Amino acid sequence: SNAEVIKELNKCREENSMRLDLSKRSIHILPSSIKELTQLTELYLYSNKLQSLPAEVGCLVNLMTLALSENSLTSLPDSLDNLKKLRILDLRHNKLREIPSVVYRLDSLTTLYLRFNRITTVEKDIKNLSKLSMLSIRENKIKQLPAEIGELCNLITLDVAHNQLEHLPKEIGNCTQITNLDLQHNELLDLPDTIGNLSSLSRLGLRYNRLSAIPRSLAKCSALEELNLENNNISTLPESLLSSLVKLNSLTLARNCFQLYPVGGPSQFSTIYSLNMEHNRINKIPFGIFSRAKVLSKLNMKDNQLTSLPLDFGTWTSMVELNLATNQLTKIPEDVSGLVSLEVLILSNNLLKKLPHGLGNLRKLRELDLEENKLESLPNEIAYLKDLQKLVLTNNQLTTLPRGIGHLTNLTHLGLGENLLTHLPEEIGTLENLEELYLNDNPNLHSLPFELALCSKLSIMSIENCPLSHLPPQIVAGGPSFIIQFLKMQGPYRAM
Amino acid sequence: LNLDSIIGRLLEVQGSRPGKNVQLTENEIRGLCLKSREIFLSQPILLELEAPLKICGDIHGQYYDLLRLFEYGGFPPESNYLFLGDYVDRGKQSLETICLLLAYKIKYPENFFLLRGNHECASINRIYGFYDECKRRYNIKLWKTFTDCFNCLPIAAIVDEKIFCCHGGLSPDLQSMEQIRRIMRPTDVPDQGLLCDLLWSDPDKDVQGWGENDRGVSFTFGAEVVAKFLHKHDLDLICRAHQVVEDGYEFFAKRQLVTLFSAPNYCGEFDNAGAMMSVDETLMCSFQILKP
Amino acid sequence: VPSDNLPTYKLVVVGDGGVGKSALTIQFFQKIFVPDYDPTIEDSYLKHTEIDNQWAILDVLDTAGREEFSAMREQYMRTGDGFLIVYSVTDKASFEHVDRFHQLILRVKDRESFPMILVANKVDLMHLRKITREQGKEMATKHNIPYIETSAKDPPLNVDKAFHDLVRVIRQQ
Ligand SMILES: Nc1nc2c(ncn2[C@@H]2O[C@H](COP(=O)(O)OP(=O)(O)NP(=O)(O)O)[C@@H](O)[C@H]2O)c(=O)[nH]1
Ligand SMILES: [Mg+2]
Ligand SMILES: [Mn+2]
Ligand SMILES: [Mn+2]
């Protein structure tokens, strides 16, 4: 309401308040009487409909915060020149097609946010803003940065993610106080060797670019806590990169061009807790590669070219989560019994026809995903997986379940769809915690055991494309809730 | 990726009798998915586009009907395109349809745009055909590769500050455009909330405000909702799809909203024309009717 | 289908960097878990939802936890009707800093007490957990505020409950 706006403006000069909050008021045009309120040090105009700022704002010469996020601004008045104490300028979510020329003259600025505009260029005048400790210009259309970026020697955070950069000026190396360098989602073909000059660098966003290699000088950025190269064109790493990154907690090589593990042997993996190499073309895991990876607890090899596992994979005793999905494995060796700490084992989209007896020794296993294999049976020893909560067997060749399945009393999710099941064992009735049971697309499943009625927590059951011809047609046409009620009422457990 | 060769073979069957497949290799199609996926993520989830632009509604895998659309409108890059979703399911050649669209997206990424429809969703296109077609002609691994790609599609577009486009429609929760920008990708489509409603909701003339939707998902919204939305965000038009309309397109709320449907004689059950909307340099629209 | 003239509750999520404020918020609104870390400057979310059969509009403001991202945080907090104070159970320093955020809220709002819930996040990470449930209930009792454990990771734990309970605190004051 414009009535309220002018009312709040009078209140401000009446109280002589140093802060004016006009956010979220649907303001199209700011009244020129704001020129009166020269005591202001903070002015909040965010979340309005401003297309321009009146020149009278240049009269607010004591402002240290000018907050304009989420408007429709297409420029700024040259009168902002007078705001010689301005420290924070927030211009996110506007419609600027360039950094307004007056912003390049606001040399007192330390904090400048330009996210989500339409900017294509950063002028050499950016060197005027030499006191900037935070520059964010992500989500624009910038293709190049000027060499003058190197004159922002107080920069702590530089965020140029979500642009169209093909290169970084080598002068980035002169911004030696940078701890956050955000370059993800650009078109970067390389990094400058001067990136090693940023000895305080601790967060480096590189994912979704076009990198073919990482400079050896990155080894100097020994405060890096994560290295995430996801979605680039990288196939190797510089010789001593990873062992030099002594604080590395996580390494992501996903969606690159890897065919082999990076050379350097086991010491490269001594500090990381997680290794993600999904979506590459890696054809083997080297013998002994994790012999020094004492804290590595998560390994993701999904969607590679593995046809077998290394001979020592039973020694991966620190592993808690293991994803081998979408490879070409034909067997799992009996030595799997060594992974007694494993909690998540993802094996979907492989060529497995059977599972080893040693599977029964995975005493901590909580999730086992085997969808889209060729499994013709399950070993009797799966009955020993007492921690198991989720068992996914969708799209396999199963004809029966072992009766021992009923010993998995912590199971909540059982996926049996798209199999060859002719019946469910009566022992399913001791799955006291079962909540989701998927039976869809078992075309020779003509009946269900009355014991299914003892699964008191069952709330999702799918039975589409099961004939279930031994049940009344009206009941199976009514769907799972009718089937279960029928099993309760017509079976021996109705009183229960 | 041999992009021009893929496009050539996809266009080779132009003129032939409908139904004739195009046998791209598995590695070619997965390459289309991977390369378009990263381009989708390199661009905003709320696209800001400029006219001239041709806007098309549902295709639903009617590949030869899509080839006719490009004949009337001009094959890229002769014209710029925005499609509003629902490329797969129902039709007979979902694969050829999506592959050509992805190839054009990779080839002309600044001039060709694809929004997400409610069928660009694994839980939906598992049921209505695309999964079956994938498993028939290739394999499940490829279908899941498509899902990774669909999960990255943008959700809405605004053309020249004035035309707001999405597949489904408005949401009770949509109060500022930056809420759409805060939708993270890759993502599945949720059962309810903003992203659901943008892909699932429908206008309705008999509803005052918001009403429940016969589909069992999301909402209906009335003409007064449309008017207040346009006024709030200083827009002139909502362009959406998602509902088959007899004459290819249908105005709503005194032409403040248009429904576009580009799949003529949809499924075979409906005797409907398709249509596209051409937007010129001055935001003047024109509607081309596509005969069955 | 929401009702008509609903009240709006402005909920503000505060806490140290990396504790999961944004992952909780995004799980709550978009129903996914975002695994990659992107520091927040400021973001907001809005939904219509029914809590205890009363319809509400929840406007949720997600704030910066990293020091170098924290420009304007006081002003954004100043507009709140209630707060989630979030710490990570794997991050001792984030738990210690609960007192600082509790003090910041009362000073910004100029009140001796104010609707707030203590949120102990990332409890799915059993083997890294450093702050016990006991320490957490103790911190909450010290400040006389509710305590809740959450996980933004699938399957999410108590995410809707945390936000809905904060609205209850606001209503019930
Ligand atoms: N295991 C697990 N990880 C979580 C959980 N919540 C967040 N994370 C992860 O922890 C990291 C930080 O989460 P985020 O929500 O960005 O933290 P924040 O509090 O918003 N950080 P900031 O204050 O800088 O904006 C992300 O990698 C996120 O996926 C959780 O409940 N469990
Ligand atoms: Mg955050
Ligand atoms: Mn649709
Ligand atoms: Mn449709």
Side-chain angles (χ1 to χ4, degrees), chain B residues 63-88:
Chain B
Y63 183 55
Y64 282 97
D65 288 319
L66 167 65
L67 292 172
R68 295 181 49 205
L69 272 185
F70 286 136
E71 282 158 10
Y72 279 152
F75 280 79
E78 184 180 345
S79 323
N80 300 335
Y81 284 88
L82 166 78
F83 291 72
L84 300 173
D86 278 1
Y87 315 119
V88 303

PDB file of all heavy atoms in Angstrom, chain B residues 63-88:
ATOM      1  N   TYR B  63       5.849 -38.792 -33.276  1.00  0.00           N
ATOM      2  CA  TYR B  63       7.057 -38.282 -33.913  1.00  0.00           C
ATOM      3  C   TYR B  63       6.760 -37.671 -35.272  1.00  0.00           C
ATOM      4  O   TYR B  63       7.355 -36.651 -35.645  1.00  0.00           O
ATOM      5  CB  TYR B  63       8.088 -39.395 -34.063  1.00  0.00           C
ATOM      6  CG  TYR B  63       9.384 -38.910 -34.663  1.00  0.00           C
ATOM      7  CD1 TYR B  63      10.070 -37.849 -34.095  1.00  0.00           C
ATOM      8  CD2 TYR B  63       9.927 -39.515 -35.791  1.00  0.00           C
ATOM      9  CE1 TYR B  63      11.258 -37.397 -34.627  1.00  0.00           C
ATOM     10  CE2 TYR B  63      11.126 -39.068 -36.333  1.00  0.00           C
ATOM     11  CZ  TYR B  63      11.782 -38.011 -35.744  1.00  0.00           C
ATOM     12  OH  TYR B  63      12.968 -37.553 -36.252  1.00  0.00           O
ATOM     13  N   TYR B  64       5.869 -38.295 -36.039  1.00  0.00           N
ATOM     14  CA  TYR B  64       5.597 -37.766 -37.370  1.00  0.00           C
ATOM     15  C   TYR B  64       4.771 -36.490 -37.298  1.00  0.00           C
ATOM     16  O   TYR B  64       4.891 -35.626 -38.172  1.00  0.00           O
ATOM     17  CB  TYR B  64       4.941 -38.846 -38.227  1.00  0.00           C
ATOM     18  CG  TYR B  64       5.978 -39.828 -38.733  1.00  0.00           C
ATOM     19  CD1 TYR B  64       6.210 -41.031 -38.076  1.00  0.00           C
ATOM     20  CD2 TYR B  64       6.762 -39.523 -39.841  1.00  0.00           C
ATOM     21  CE1 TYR B  64       7.172 -41.914 -38.529  1.00  0.00           C
ATOM     22  CE2 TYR B  64       7.722 -40.395 -40.301  1.00  0.00           C
ATOM     23  CZ  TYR B  64       7.927 -41.589 -39.644  1.00  0.00           C
ATOM     24  OH  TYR B  64       8.889 -42.456 -40.111  1.00  0.00           O
ATOM     25  N   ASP B  65       3.979 -36.331 -36.234  1.00  0.00           N
ATOM     26  CA  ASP B  65       3.312 -35.057 -35.984  1.00  0.00           C
ATOM     27  C   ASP B  65       4.294 -33.978 -35.552  1.00  0.00           C
ATOM     28  O   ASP B  65       4.084 -32.796 -35.853  1.00  0.00           O
ATOM     29  CB  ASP B  65       2.221 -35.248 -34.937  1.00  0.00           C
ATOM     30  CG  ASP B  65       1.038 -35.999 -35.488  1.00  0.00           C
ATOM     31  OD1 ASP B  65       0.667 -35.710 -36.648  1.00  0.00           O
ATOM     32  OD2 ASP B  65       0.489 -36.874 -34.785  1.00  0.00           O
ATOM     33  N   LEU B  66       5.365 -34.355 -34.846  1.00  0.00           N
ATOM     34  CA  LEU B  66       6.399 -33.382 -34.517  1.00  0.00           C
ATOM     35  C   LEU B  66       7.145 -32.943 -35.767  1.00  0.00           C
ATOM     36  O   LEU B  66       7.521 -31.772 -35.898  1.00  0.00           O
ATOM     37  CB  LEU B  66       7.376 -33.967 -33.488  1.00  0.00           C
ATOM     38  CG  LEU B  66       8.667 -33.173 -33.286  1.00  0.00           C
ATOM     39  CD1 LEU B  66       8.379 -31.814 -32.693  1.00  0.00           C
ATOM     40  CD2 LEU B  66       9.661 -33.938 -32.401  1.00  0.00           C
ATOM     41  N   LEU B  67       7.393 -33.878 -36.686  1.00  0.00           N
ATOM     42  CA  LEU B  67       8.054 -33.513 -37.930  1.00  0.00           C
ATOM     43  C   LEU B  67       7.199 -32.542 -38.735  1.00  0.00           C
ATOM     44  O   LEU B  67       7.732 -31.626 -39.368  1.00  0.00           O
ATOM     45  CB  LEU B  67       8.380 -34.771 -38.735  1.00  0.00           C
ATOM     46  CG  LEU B  67       9.450 -35.649 -38.068  1.00  0.00           C
ATOM     47  CD1 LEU B  67       9.607 -36.985 -38.779  1.00  0.00           C
ATOM     48  CD2 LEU B  67      10.783 -34.897 -37.992  1.00  0.00           C
ATOM     49  N   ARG B  68       5.873 -32.686 -38.668  1.00  0.00           N
ATOM     50  CA  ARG B  68       4.990 -31.733 -39.342  1.00  0.00           C
ATOM     51  C   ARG B  68       5.073 -30.348 -38.710  1.00  0.00           C
ATOM     52  O   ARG B  68       5.062 -29.335 -39.424  1.00  0.00           O
ATOM     53  CB  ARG B  68       3.554 -32.245 -39.318  1.00  0.00           C
ATOM     54  CG  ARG B  68       3.350 -33.521 -40.106  1.00  0.00           C
ATOM     55  CD  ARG B  68       1.897 -33.956 -40.044  1.00  0.00           C
ATOM     56  NE  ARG B  68       0.999 -32.850 -40.363  1.00  0.00           N
ATOM     57  CZ  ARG B  68      -0.257 -32.766 -39.950  1.00  0.00           C
ATOM     58  NH1 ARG B  68      -0.806 -33.715 -39.206  1.00  0.00           N
ATOM     59  NH2 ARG B  68      -0.981 -31.701 -40.283  1.00  0.00           N
ATOM     60  N   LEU B  69       5.148 -30.284 -37.371  1.00  0.00           N
ATOM     61  CA  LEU B  69       5.312 -29.004 -36.688  1.00  0.00           C
ATOM     62  C   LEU B  69       6.543 -28.264 -37.183  1.00  0.00           C
ATOM     63  O   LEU B  69       6.498 -27.049 -37.404  1.00  0.00           O
ATOM     64  CB  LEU B  69       5.417 -29.216 -35.175  1.00  0.00           C
ATOM     65  CG  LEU B  69       4.140 -29.250 -34.351  1.00  0.00           C
ATOM     66  CD1 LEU B  69       4.483 -29.348 -32.874  1.00  0.00           C
ATOM     67  CD2 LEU B  69       3.313 -28.008 -34.630  1.00  0.00           C
ATOM     68  N   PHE B  70       7.666 -28.974 -37.331  1.00  0.00           N
ATOM     69  CA  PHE B  70       8.877 -28.313 -37.799  1.00  0.00           C
ATOM     70  C   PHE B  70       8.755 -27.912 -39.265  1.00  0.00           C
ATOM     71  O   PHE B  70       9.402 -26.954 -39.695  1.00  0.00           O
ATOM     72  CB  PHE B  70      10.093 -29.216 -37.577  1.00  0.00           C
ATOM     73  CG  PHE B  70      10.529 -29.324 -36.121  1.00  0.00           C
ATOM     74  CD1 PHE B  70      10.857 -30.552 -35.573  1.00  0.00           C
ATOM     75  CD2 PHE B  70      10.615 -28.194 -35.319  1.00  0.00           C
ATOM     76  CE1 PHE B  70      11.263 -30.659 -34.242  1.00  0.00           C
ATOM     77  CE2 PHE B  70      11.021 -28.291 -33.990  1.00  0.00           C
ATOM     78  CZ  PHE B  70      11.345 -29.531 -33.454  1.00  0.00           C
ATOM     79  N   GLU B  71       7.931 -28.623 -40.040  1.00  0.00           N
ATOM     80  CA  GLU B  71       7.699 -28.235 -41.433  1.00  0.00           C
ATOM     81  C   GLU B  71       6.964 -26.903 -41.514  1.00  0.00           C
ATOM     82  O   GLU B  71       7.352 -26.013 -42.282  1.00  0.00           O
ATOM     83  CB  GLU B  71       6.918 -29.330 -42.163  1.00  0.00           C
ATOM     84  CG  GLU B  71       7.757 -30.534 -42.580  1.00  0.00           C
ATOM     85  CD  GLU B  71       6.924 -31.792 -42.800  1.00  0.00           C
ATOM     86  OE1 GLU B  71       5.678 -31.681 -42.819  1.00  0.00           O
ATOM     87  OE2 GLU B  71       7.512 -32.892 -42.940  1.00  0.00           O
ATOM     88  N   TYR B  72       5.904 -26.744 -40.715  1.00  0.00           N
ATOM     89  CA  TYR B  72       5.135 -25.503 -40.726  1.00  0.00           C
ATOM     90  C   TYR B  72       5.911 -24.367 -40.076  1.00  0.00           C
ATOM     91  O   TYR B  72       5.952 -23.248 -40.600  1.00  0.00           O
ATOM     92  CB  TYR B  72       3.793 -25.709 -40.020  1.00  0.00           C
ATOM     93  CG  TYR B  72       2.749 -26.362 -40.893  1.00  0.00           C
ATOM     94  CD1 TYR B  72       1.727 -27.128 -40.343  1.00  0.00           C
ATOM     95  CD2 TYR B  72       2.785 -26.208 -42.277  1.00  0.00           C
ATOM     96  CE1 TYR B  72       0.767 -27.729 -41.155  1.00  0.00           C
ATOM     97  CE2 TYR B  72       1.839 -26.803 -43.092  1.00  0.00           C
ATOM     98  CZ  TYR B  72       0.832 -27.561 -42.529  1.00  0.00           C
ATOM     99  OH  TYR B  72      -0.111 -28.141 -43.354  1.00  0.00           O
ATOM    100  N   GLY B  73       6.528 -24.630 -38.922  1.00  0.00           N
ATOM    101  CA  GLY B  73       7.230 -23.569 -38.230  1.00  0.00           C
ATOM    102  C   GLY B  73       8.628 -23.311 -38.731  1.00  0.00           C
ATOM    103  O   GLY B  73       9.177 -22.241 -38.460  1.00  0.00           O
ATOM    104  N   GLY B  74       9.221 -24.262 -39.449  1.00  0.00           N
ATOM    105  CA  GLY B  74      10.622 -24.146 -39.811  1.00  0.00           C
ATOM    106  C   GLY B  74      11.520 -25.006 -38.936  1.00  0.00           C
ATOM    107  O   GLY B  74      11.457 -24.919 -37.705  1.00  0.00           O
ATOM    108  N   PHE B  75      12.343 -25.852 -39.557  1.00  0.00           N
ATOM    109  CA  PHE B  75      13.261 -26.692 -38.799  1.00  0.00           C
ATOM    110  C   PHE B  75      14.353 -25.833 -38.172  1.00  0.00           C
ATOM    111  O   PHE B  75      14.851 -24.904 -38.810  1.00  0.00           O
ATOM    112  CB  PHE B  75      13.896 -27.756 -39.698  1.00  0.00           C
ATOM    113  CG  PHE B  75      13.012 -28.940 -39.960  1.00  0.00           C
ATOM    114  CD1 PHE B  75      11.998 -28.875 -40.898  1.00  0.00           C
ATOM    115  CD2 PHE B  75      13.208 -30.128 -39.277  1.00  0.00           C
ATOM    116  CE1 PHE B  75      11.188 -29.970 -41.140  1.00  0.00           C
ATOM    117  CE2 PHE B  75      12.401 -31.223 -39.514  1.00  0.00           C
ATOM    118  CZ  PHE B  75      11.392 -31.147 -40.452  1.00  0.00           C
ATOM    119  N   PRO B  76      14.742 -26.113 -36.928  1.00  0.00           N
ATOM    120  CA  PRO B  76      15.797 -25.321 -36.303  1.00  0.00           C
ATOM    121  C   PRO B  76      17.045 -25.332 -37.162  1.00  0.00           C
ATOM    122  O   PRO B  76      17.337 -26.329 -37.849  1.00  0.00           O
ATOM    123  CB  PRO B  76      16.024 -26.035 -34.962  1.00  0.00           C
ATOM    124  CG  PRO B  76      14.718 -26.739 -34.695  1.00  0.00           C
ATOM    125  CD  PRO B  76      14.226 -27.164 -36.034  1.00  0.00           C
ATOM    126  N   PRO B  77      17.800 -24.228 -37.186  1.00  0.00           N
ATOM    127  CA  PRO B  77      17.592 -22.997 -36.429  1.00  0.00           C
ATOM    128  C   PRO B  77      16.767 -21.951 -37.192  1.00  0.00           C
ATOM    129  O   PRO B  77      16.925 -20.764 -36.908  1.00  0.00           O
ATOM    130  CB  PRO B  77      19.013 -22.490 -36.244  1.00  0.00           C
ATOM    131  CG  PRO B  77      19.633 -22.814 -37.604  1.00  0.00           C
ATOM    132  CD  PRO B  77      18.970 -24.105 -38.076  1.00  0.00           C
ATOM    133  N   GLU B  78      15.936 -22.381 -38.148  1.00  0.00           N
ATOM    134  CA  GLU B  78      15.157 -21.418 -38.924  1.00  0.00           C
ATOM    135  C   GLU B  78      14.202 -20.637 -38.031  1.00  0.00           C
ATOM    136  O   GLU B  78      13.954 -19.448 -38.272  1.00  0.00           O
ATOM    137  CB  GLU B  78      14.390 -22.136 -40.038  1.00  0.00           C
ATOM    138  CG  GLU B  78      13.608 -21.221 -40.974  1.00  0.00           C
ATOM    139  CD  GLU B  78      12.875 -21.992 -42.061  1.00  0.00           C
ATOM    140  OE1 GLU B  78      13.190 -23.188 -42.260  1.00  0.00           O
ATOM    141  OE2 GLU B  78      11.982 -21.406 -42.709  1.00  0.00           O
ATOM    142  N   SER B  79      13.672 -21.283 -36.994  1.00  0.00           N
ATOM    143  CA  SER B  79      12.875 -20.626 -35.972  1.00  0.00           C
ATOM    144  C   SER B  79      13.371 -21.072 -34.601  1.00  0.00           C
ATOM    145  O   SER B  79      14.004 -22.119 -34.459  1.00  0.00           O
ATOM    146  CB  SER B  79      11.383 -20.952 -36.119  1.00  0.00           C
ATOM    147  OG  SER B  79      11.004 -21.039 -37.486  1.00  0.00           O
ATOM    148  N   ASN B  80      13.094 -20.250 -33.597  1.00  0.00           N
ATOM    149  CA  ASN B  80      13.339 -20.617 -32.211  1.00  0.00           C
ATOM    150  C   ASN B  80      12.109 -21.298 -31.635  1.00  0.00           C
ATOM    151  O   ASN B  80      10.975 -20.956 -31.982  1.00  0.00           O
ATOM    152  CB  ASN B  80      13.707 -19.388 -31.392  1.00  0.00           C
ATOM    153  CG  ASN B  80      14.954 -18.718 -31.910  1.00  0.00           C
ATOM    154  OD1 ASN B  80      15.791 -19.361 -32.541  1.00  0.00           O
ATOM    155  ND2 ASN B  80      15.084 -17.418 -31.662  1.00  0.00           N
ATOM    156  N   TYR B  81      12.338 -22.283 -30.765  1.00  0.00           N
ATOM    157  CA  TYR B  81      11.260 -23.091 -30.232  1.00  0.00           C
ATOM    158  C   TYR B  81      11.315 -23.132 -28.713  1.00  0.00           C
ATOM    159  O   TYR B  81      12.387 -23.068 -28.103  1.00  0.00           O
ATOM    160  CB  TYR B  81      11.304 -24.521 -30.776  1.00  0.00           C
ATOM    161  CG  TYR B  81      10.804 -24.614 -32.193  1.00  0.00           C
ATOM    162  CD1 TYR B  81      11.668 -24.422 -33.258  1.00  0.00           C
ATOM    163  CD2 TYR B  81       9.462 -24.860 -32.469  1.00  0.00           C
ATOM    164  CE1 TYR B  81      11.217 -24.486 -34.574  1.00  0.00           C
ATOM    165  CE2 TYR B  81       8.997 -24.929 -33.794  1.00  0.00           C
ATOM    166  CZ  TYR B  81       9.890 -24.736 -34.838  1.00  0.00           C
ATOM    167  OH  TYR B  81       9.477 -24.803 -36.164  1.00  0.00           O
ATOM    168  N   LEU B  82      10.128 -23.223 -28.118  1.00  0.00           N
ATOM    169  CA  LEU B  82       9.954 -23.605 -26.724  1.00  0.00           C
ATOM    170  C   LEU B  82       8.856 -24.649 -26.700  1.00  0.00           C
ATOM    171  O   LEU B  82       7.739 -24.385 -27.157  1.00  0.00           O
ATOM    172  CB  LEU B  82       9.582 -22.408 -25.844  1.00  0.00           C
ATOM    173  CG  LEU B  82       9.061 -22.777 -24.455  1.00  0.00           C
ATOM    174  CD1 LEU B  82      10.243 -23.148 -23.564  1.00  0.00           C
ATOM    175  CD2 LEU B  82       8.266 -21.640 -23.858  1.00  0.00           C
ATOM    176  N   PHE B  83       9.175 -25.842 -26.223  1.00  0.00           N
ATOM    177  CA  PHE B  83       8.158 -26.850 -25.994  1.00  0.00           C
ATOM    178  C   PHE B  83       7.822 -26.875 -24.509  1.00  0.00           C
ATOM    179  O   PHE B  83       8.674 -26.586 -23.660  1.00  0.00           O
ATOM    180  CB  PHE B  83       8.628 -28.223 -26.461  1.00  0.00           C
ATOM    181  CG  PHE B  83       8.757 -28.350 -27.961  1.00  0.00           C
ATOM    182  CD1 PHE B  83       9.787 -27.714 -28.637  1.00  0.00           C
ATOM    183  CD2 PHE B  83       7.861 -29.125 -28.681  1.00  0.00           C
ATOM    184  CE1 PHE B  83       9.915 -27.837 -30.019  1.00  0.00           C
ATOM    185  CE2 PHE B  83       7.980 -29.248 -30.060  1.00  0.00           C
ATOM    186  CZ  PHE B  83       9.018 -28.604 -30.722  1.00  0.00           C
ATOM    187  N   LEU B  84       6.568 -27.212 -24.200  1.00  0.00           N
ATOM    188  CA  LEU B  84       6.046 -27.071 -22.849  1.00  0.00           C
ATOM    189  C   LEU B  84       5.948 -28.399 -22.099  1.00  0.00           C
ATOM    190  O   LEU B  84       5.284 -28.460 -21.065  1.00  0.00           O
ATOM    191  CB  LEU B  84       4.675 -26.382 -22.873  1.00  0.00           C
ATOM    192  CG  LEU B  84       4.639 -24.974 -23.476  1.00  0.00           C
ATOM    193  CD1 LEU B  84       3.210 -24.500 -23.576  1.00  0.00           C
ATOM    194  CD2 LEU B  84       5.478 -23.971 -22.675  1.00  0.00           C
ATOM    195  N   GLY B  85       6.582 -29.456 -22.587  1.00  0.00           N
ATOM    196  CA  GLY B  85       6.661 -30.697 -21.840  1.00  0.00           C
ATOM    197  C   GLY B  85       5.842 -31.809 -22.472  1.00  0.00           C
ATOM    198  O   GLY B  85       5.161 -31.630 -23.483  1.00  0.00           O
ATOM    199  N   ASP B  86       5.943 -32.983 -21.841  1.00  0.00           N
ATOM    200  CA  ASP B  86       5.196 -34.183 -22.216  1.00  0.00           C
ATOM    201  C   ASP B  86       5.596 -34.662 -23.611  1.00  0.00           C
ATOM    202  O   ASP B  86       4.779 -34.770 -24.538  1.00  0.00           O
ATOM    203  CB  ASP B  86       3.684 -33.957 -22.104  1.00  0.00           C
ATOM    204  CG  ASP B  86       3.180 -34.132 -20.685  1.00  0.00           C
ATOM    205  OD1 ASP B  86       4.000 -34.414 -19.787  1.00  0.00           O
ATOM    206  OD2 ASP B  86       1.967 -33.985 -20.453  1.00  0.00           O
ATOM    207  N   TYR B  87       6.891 -34.959 -23.731  1.00  0.00           N
ATOM    208  CA  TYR B  87       7.476 -35.453 -24.967  1.00  0.00           C
ATOM    209  C   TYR B  87       7.249 -36.946 -25.157  1.00  0.00           C
ATOM    210  O   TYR B  87       7.200 -37.419 -26.296  1.00  0.00           O
ATOM    211  CB  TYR B  87       8.969 -35.127 -24.970  1.00  0.00           C
ATOM    212  CG  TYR B  87       9.204 -33.715 -24.527  1.00  0.00           C
ATOM    213  CD1 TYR B  87       9.952 -33.418 -23.391  1.00  0.00           C
ATOM    214  CD2 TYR B  87       8.635 -32.670 -25.227  1.00  0.00           C
ATOM    215  CE1 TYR B  87      10.130 -32.115 -22.990  1.00  0.00           C
ATOM    216  CE2 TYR B  87       8.815 -31.388 -24.844  1.00  0.00           C
ATOM    217  CZ  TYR B  87       9.548 -31.102 -23.736  1.00  0.00           C
ATOM    218  OH  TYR B  87       9.678 -29.793 -23.397  1.00  0.00           O
ATOM    219  N   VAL B  88       7.095 -37.694 -24.069  1.00  0.00           N
ATOM    220  CA  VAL B  88       7.037 -39.145 -24.106  1.00  0.00           C
ATOM    221  C   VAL B  88       5.667 -39.603 -23.630  1.00  0.00           C
ATOM    222  O   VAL B  88       4.855 -38.811 -23.147  1.00  0.00           O
ATOM    223  CB  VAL B  88       8.134 -39.792 -23.241  1.00  0.00           C
ATOM    224  CG1 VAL B  88       9.521 -39.330 -23.681  1.00  0.00           C
ATOM    225  CG2 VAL B  88       7.871 -39.466 -21.781  1.00  0.00           C
TER     226      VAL B  88
END
